Amino acid sequence: MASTTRLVNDRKQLEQQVKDDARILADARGLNITTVANDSATGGQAIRNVG
């Protein structure tokens, strides 16, 4: 029970902080949206009324 028993939590906090400041400064470069089309047809068997 000393300062050596606080290393794992220290690493957790350090990891979270590094993940945050690696993204605050990263540049924002937006991409161009493409591949948009109507390709969601639905199949099945017809009714074919008899008479």
Next chain:
Amino acid sequence: YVAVRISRFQLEVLRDLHDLVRSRTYLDVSKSPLATTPIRVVEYVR
């Protein structure tokens, strides 16, 4: 037999030689020169 004509012709008369003088606007590079390079900013995370 039929003649196609127009109306409202806009032309400018002068009546003096001095009226051929107009004015433009230029940049004075003597005291407001053109920049050559950007500012080169550097950032640090708080």
